[PDB]
Design a protein around this ligand. Structure first.
Ligand SMILES: [Cl-]
Ligand SMILES: [Cl-]
Ligand SMILES: [Mg+2]
Ligand SMILES: [Mg+2]
Ligand SMILES: [Mg+2]
Ligand SMILES: [Mg+2]
Ligand SMILES: [Mg+2]
Ligand SMILES: [Mg+2]
Ligand SMILES: [Mg+2]
Ligand SMILES: [Mg+2]
Ligand code: NA
Ligand code: NA
Ligand code: NA
Ligand code: NA
Ligand code: NA
Ligand SMILES: [Sr+2]
Ligand SMILES: [Sr+2]
Ligand SMILES: [Sr+2]
Ligand SMILES: [Sr+2]
Ligand SMILES: [Sr+2]
Ligand SMILES: [Sr+2]
Ligand SMILES: [Sr+2]
Lengths: 140, 95, 160, 154, 186
RNA sequence: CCUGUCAAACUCCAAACUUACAGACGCUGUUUGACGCGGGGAUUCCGGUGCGCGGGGU
RNA sequence: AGUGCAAGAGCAAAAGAUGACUUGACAGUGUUCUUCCCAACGAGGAACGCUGACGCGAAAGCGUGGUCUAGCGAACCAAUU
RNA sequence: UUAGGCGGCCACAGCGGUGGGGUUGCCUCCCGUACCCAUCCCGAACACGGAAGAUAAGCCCACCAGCGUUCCAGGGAGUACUGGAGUGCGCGAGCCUCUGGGAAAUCCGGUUCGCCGCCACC
C-alpha cells in the first residue's frame, strides 16, 4: 500500500534569473548537465524593451543527477515551515526548487488519456516535511 | 440597413448559443447526401468555410449534384430559382 | 418644462449609458428614509403609495414628491421618529429636447425619468399603529406632486 | 358537421380570409356551406370566425333548408325527395340530411351545389358587430341558436 | 459545471483519447481508417469504416491472438507490431477492404515507430495506404535484430520466461511466412 | 448575507407570429390549357387615408 | 488572452503561442452566389470546382494571402509583356 | 467489456464525494536506455525494451445530489404577451369583450452521478 504512496523526487530545478547570461557556467559545473536560456514576455521599464531575450538560465535534474545534487544542496539551506507549497513543493535561496510527488505522476504528464491527479493522491505539506526530514536533516 | 454587406443583420443567425460554442463534431461535416434529397440549410457558426449566403438560412433545397466535395442544392428565392454551393457542414436531412 | 412633454411612455427605452453622454445627475437626494438601520418587518404597519396610471415621473417630480412627503414625517414624528419610508423607483429613462427646425431633430439630453406601470408602489412606508395617520397625510401631499392619481393602500394593519 | 353562413361582406375584409371563404365554396353574403369537422376544416372556420355564423344544425332544420335552398350542380331544378331519390344514393331528403351530418358524403358528391344560397333572416339577425356571447350573431352557435338563424333564412 | 454558459468538452476530447481535428482531416479521404493503437504489453490494428450510429469495425488484429498461429515471444515490440499489422491487413482483404488511410491517434509520427511498422505490415498484406517509405523502420529492426543485438550485451537474460537465450528474429521470418501462406484459418 | 431598481445597440430564458419544404384536405387546371416559356404594346417611378407595429419630434 | 484596425461574429491537443521549413500573395479556365432579397444591371467580391506548376506533412490534408463581413473604378489616352 | 479499441449524441455525460476490483488474463502505474526516436536542459514527455513489484493513481464497478444540467407533476398562470374581430369603455395615455395561441422568473415534489453503436475478449 504505502509502497505506491511513498514520494520521490520528480525534478530539481535550479535557476538564476538575472535580467540582461554569463552565469550559465556555474550551474553547468555544480549540477552535471547542460543549461537552458530563460526568456520573458511583456515590456518592462527596467530596460526590458526586447521581448524574447536571454534573462536567465535553468536546469531540470532527474533521478541520480537530482539526488546527488541534493546530498550537497540541502545542507546549505535552512529549511522552514512556511517554505512549502500546498502540493508539497519547496523553493529555497540562486534558487533551487524540488517537485515532490507520489509513484504515478505519469498519468497527468503523459499524452494519451491523461487525467489530473485526485486531491486524495496529491502530496501534502505534512507528508512532504516527513519524507524530506526522513533523509539527513531537520524541519521547522 | 446602415451598410449592405453579406453579414449585415446576421448577429444572431450566425452565432452559437454558449453551450454550442467551440469546434463542431466531424460526423455532419462528412455526411453523404444523394441527388434528389431534401436538405435543410443552416450555417454552423463554428464552421468558417463552405457557407452559403446568410440570406438563405432556413431553406430546404434539393441536392442536385456536387462540386468537388461541396454540394449543389437547388432552392427558390421568392420565385427566382438558384443553385447553392454548400458543404455538408451546413446541411441536415429533412424528416 | 411641463411634465406634458415626458409623462407618457411613447419612446423606446433609452437607458444605455454606454451610448448616451452628458446625462444630468439625479435631483433625488435619498431613496431610504427614516431609520435605515431598522427593518421593515419590525413595524406593524406598512402603507404604500400606488400609482394608478402607467407613466414616466421625472427626478424633479420624484424629489419634490418624496421631499414634501418625508418632510411631513420628520415634522410629525420628529427628525429621528420611529418610521422608515422608501422610494423603490430609480430614474433610468434619459430624456431629450430638440432645443434648426425639424432638420437634425434628435434632441440633446435634458434629464432622466422613472418608468412606472399602473398599480405599482412608488413609495412604501413602515411605521407603528399610532403614527399611521401621519403617514397617510405624508402620501396625500406626495401624490399631489406627481402626474397620476394614486391609492394609499394599507398592506399590514387590521388596526383600524 | 357544421353550417357556415357568411354574415359580413367582402369590402375591407383581409384577402387571406376572403380566399378561405372562397375555398369553402362560399362567395356571397348569406351563402351557406355544410363543412365537416376535421383538423383542416377547423383552421379555416376559426379564420373566418368574425365574418361568419356557424354551428351544428338539427336534422329537422337541415331538412327544411335542403328542401328549400339546395340546388343541382347545374340547374334551376327543385331538390325534393323525388329528386334526391333519382340522382342521389338516398331515398329522400331526410336520408341525405342524415348522411351529411354523420359526414358520410358531400353535397357535391351527390351532384348538388356546395352552396345553400339562403334568404335574408326574417325579422333580422342579432347584429354583425358582436359575437354570440355578447348578444351578436357572429361566431359559433348553439344547435338551437344556429337553427333559429337557418330557419329564419330559409 | 459552473453554470449555464459553461462549455463542457466533447466526451472523447474530455477523456483525452480522440483528436477530432485530425479525425476530420482523416475522414475527408473517404477511405477506411487503419486505426493503429498501442499498449504497454500489446499492440492492435483495426480497420474502421464510418456509420450512422458510430464507427464500424470490419477487420482487426490484436497482438494477443498473434500467438494463436505460433508466436511464443513477447507482444509489445517491432516484430510483434509489424506482424499484427500484416494479420489485420489480411483479415481486411477477406471482407473486401482494398484501401486504407493510417490513423495513429494521439501517437507521435516518429521515424521507425511501431505504428509505422503496423502500417508497413498492412500494406504488405496487400492493402493500399498512403505511406512514406523512408519514414518506415528498416527491415532488420522490423525483424527485431536490434533486440537480439541487445541480448548480445548479456550477463543477465533479456527475457524472464524462457523463450530462448539469444532470442529469435528468425521466429519473425517463420511467422511472416506462415501468414503469406493461403491456408491459415484467419 | 440582507435590501432597492434597470437596458434600442444585455440574455440562463421565451412566445404569439413570420417563414423554407413535404403530405393531407380544400380550391383550381387538363374543349374556360392552368403552372411555365417566348415575343409585341404600354402606363407608372408627386400618392393619400384608416388600423396594427413602429423611429424622430412638446 | 490572443487573433493588424470599426462593430458584430469565429477559434483551445486552435484559427491563438513558440519553433523550424517555406513564399499558394503561383499560372490558367470555370461553377455558383453576391453586387442588384424578391427581380433586370457593370466593375468589384466570396464560396466551390478543374488543368498546370509549387510548399509542407508520415499521411489523410492544408495553402487560390492576413479567421468572417470595409480597403474600391468604364471607355478613351499612356506605359509595359 | 473481471478492467479493451474505435465511435455517435456531445454536461441526462459537468463539479464534488463514497465504497469495491485484478499470480501467468486486460488496461495501467511500473522497471529500464543497446538500438529507431527524443528533449533549444532533463528516457520528464516523446520513442524504443521489458516484467520485480502494486491495485495507492488512472481506468472498470456499485452508490450519494450538495452545486451545475436534462426532463416530468402541481403552484405561479391561462397570469405576461399575442394572431383575428368589435358603432365596447376612456378627455387621453390607454383599457375591455369575443375568438384562436400562450410564456418567464419563482416554489414544491420527482428525474439526471450518461445513453447508444461497431469490434475484440472467460
Ligand atoms: Cl449562397
Ligand atoms: Cl494508443
Ligand atoms: Mg436582431
Ligand atoms: Mg347553379
Ligand atoms: Mg323588417
Ligand atoms: Mg341592426
Ligand atoms: Mg480623356
Ligand atoms: Mg507602364
Ligand atoms: Mg481503493
Ligand atoms: Mg369613446
Ligand atoms: Na460546436
Ligand atoms: Na440648418
Ligand atoms: Na461580377
Ligand atoms: Na535561445
Ligand atoms: Na487505485
Ligand atoms: Sr413617439
Ligand atoms: Sr396627481
Ligand atoms: Sr417580420
Ligand atoms: Sr480564409
Ligand atoms: Sr521511468
Ligand atoms: Sr389630458
Ligand atoms: Sr390550449
Amino acid at each position: 500500500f504505502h509502497e505506491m504512496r511513498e514520494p520521490r523526487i520528480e525534478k530539481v530545478v535550479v535557476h538564476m534569473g538575472i535580467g540582461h547570461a554569463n552565469a550559465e557556467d556555474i550551474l553547468g559545473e555544480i549540477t552535471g548537465q547542460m543549461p537552458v536560456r530563460t526568456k520573458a514576455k511583456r515590456t518592462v521599464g527596467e530596460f526590458d524593451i526586447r521581448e524574447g531575450d536571454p534573462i536567465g538560465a535553468k536546469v531540470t535534474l532527474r533521478d541520480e543527477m537530482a539526488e546527488e545534487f541534493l546530498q550537497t544542496a540541502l545542507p546549505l539551506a535552512e529549511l522552514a515551515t512556511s517554505q512549502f507549497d500546498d502540493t508539497g513543493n519547496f523553493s529555497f535561496g540562486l534558487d533551487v526548487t524540488v517537485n515532490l510527488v507520489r509513484p504515478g505522476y505519469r498519468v497527468a504528464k503523459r499524452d494519451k488519456a491523461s487525467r489530473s491527479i485526485p486531491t486524495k493522491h496529491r502530496l501534502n505539506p505534512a507528508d512532504a516535511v516527513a519524507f524530506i526530514e526522513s533523509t539527513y536533516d531537520v524541519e521547522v | 440597413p446602415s451598410s449592405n454587406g453579406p453579414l449585415e443583420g446576421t448577429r444572431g443567425k450566425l452565432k452559437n448559443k454558449p453551450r454550442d460554442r467551440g469546434t463542431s463534431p466531424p460526423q455532419r461535416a462528412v455526411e453523404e447526401f444523394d441527388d434528389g434529397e431534401k436538405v435543410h440549410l443552416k450555417i454552423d457558426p463554428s464552421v468558417p468555410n463552405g457557407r452559403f449566403h446568410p440570406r438563405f438560412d432556413g431553406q430546404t433545397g434539393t441536392v442536385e449534384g456536387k462540386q468537388g466535395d461541396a454540394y449543389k442544392v437547388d432552392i427558390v428565392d421568392g420565385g427566382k430559382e438558384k443553385t447553392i454551393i454548400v458543404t455538408a457542414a451546413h446541411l441536415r436531412r429533412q424528416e | 418644462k411641463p411634465a406634458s412633454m415626458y409623462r407618457d411612455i411613447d419612446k423606446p427605452a433609452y437607458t444605455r449609458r454606454e451610448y448616451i453622454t452628458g446625462i444630468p445627475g439625479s435631483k433625488i437626494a435619498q431613496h431610504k428614509m427614516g431609520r435605515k438601520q431598522k427593518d421593515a418587518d419590525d413595524y406593524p404597519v406598512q402603507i404604500s403609495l400606488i400609482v394608478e396610471e402607467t407613466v414616466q415621473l421625472r427626478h424633479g417630480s420624484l424629489e419634490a414628491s418624496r421631499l414634501s412627503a418625508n418632510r411631513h414625517l420628520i415634522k410629525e414624528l420628529g427628525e429621528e421618529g420611529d418610521y422608515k419610508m422608501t422610494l423603490r423607483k430609480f430614474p433610468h429613462q434619459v430624456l431629450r429636447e430638440n432645443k434648426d427646425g425639424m432638420r437634425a431633430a434628435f434632441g440633446k439630453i435634458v434629464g432622466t425619468a422613472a418608468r412606472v406601470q399602473a398599480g405599482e408602489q412608488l413609495f412604501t412606508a413602515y411605521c407603528n399603529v399610532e403614527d399611521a395617520e401621519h403617514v397617510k397625510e405624508a402620501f396625500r401631499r406626495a401624490y399631489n406632486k406627481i402626474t397620476p392619481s394614486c391609492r394609499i393602500k394599507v398592506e399590514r394593519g387590521e388596526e383600524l | 358537421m357544421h353550417a357556415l353562413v357568411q354574415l359580413r361582406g367582402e369590402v375591407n375584409m383581409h384577402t387571406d380570409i376572403q380566399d378561405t371563404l372562397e375555398m369553402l365554396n362560399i362567395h356571397h353574403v348569406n351563402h351557406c356551406t355544410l363543412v365537416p369537422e376535421t383538423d383542416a376544416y377547423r383552421g379555416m372556420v376559426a379564420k373566418v370566425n368574425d365574418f361568419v355564423a356557424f354551428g351544428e344544425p338539427s336534422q329537422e332544420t337541415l331538412e327544411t333548408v335542403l328542401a328549400t335552398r339546395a340546388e343541382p350542380l347545374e340547374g334551376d331544378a327543385d331538390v325534393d325527395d323525388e329528386w334526391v331519390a333519382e340522382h342521389t344514393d338516398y331515398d329522400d331528403i331526410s336520408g341525405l340530411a342524415f348522411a351529411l351530418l354523420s359526414e358520410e358524403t358531400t353535397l357535391r358528391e351527390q351532384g348538388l351545389s356546395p352552396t345553400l344560397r339562403l334568404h335574408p333572416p326574417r325579422g333580422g339577425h342579432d347584429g354583425v358587430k358582436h359575437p354570440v356571447k355578447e348578444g351578436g350573431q357572429l361566431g359559433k352557435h348553439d344547435t338551437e341558436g344556429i337553427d333559429d338563424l337557418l330557419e329564419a333564412m330559409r | 459545471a459552473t453554470g449555464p454558459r459553461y462549455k463542457v468538452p466533447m466526451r472523447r476530447r474530455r477523456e483525452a483519447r480522440t483528436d477530432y481535428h485530425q479525425r476530420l482531416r482523416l475522414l475527408k479521404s473517404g477511405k477506411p481508417r487503419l486505426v493503429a493503437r498501442k499498449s504497454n504489453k500489446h499492440v492492435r490494428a483495426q480497420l474502421v469504416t464510418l456509420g450512422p450510429n458510430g464507427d464500424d469495425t470490419l477487420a482487426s488484429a490484436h497482438s494477443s491472438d498473434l500467438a494463436e498461429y505460433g508466436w511464443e515471444a513477447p507482444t509489445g515490440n517491432m516484430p510483434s507490431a509489424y506482424l499484427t499489422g500484416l494479420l489485420a491487413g489480411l483479415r481486411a482483404q477477406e471482407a473486401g477492404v482494398e484501401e486504407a488511410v493510417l490513423d495513429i491517434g494521439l501517437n507521435s509520427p516518429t521515424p521507425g515507430s511501431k505504428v509505422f511498422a503496423i502500417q508497413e505490415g498492412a500494406i504488405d498484406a496487400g492493402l493500399d495506404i498512403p505511406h512514406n517509405d523512408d519514414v518506415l523502420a528498416d527491415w532488420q529492426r522490423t525483424r527485431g535484430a536490434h533486440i537480439a543485438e541487445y541480448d548480445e550485451q548479456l550477463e543477465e537474460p533479456l527475457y524472464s520466461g524462457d523463450f530462448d537465450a539469444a532470442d529469435l528474429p528468425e521466429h519473425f521470418d517463420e511467422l511472416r511466412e506462415t501468414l503469406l501462406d493461403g491456408d491459415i484459418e484467419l
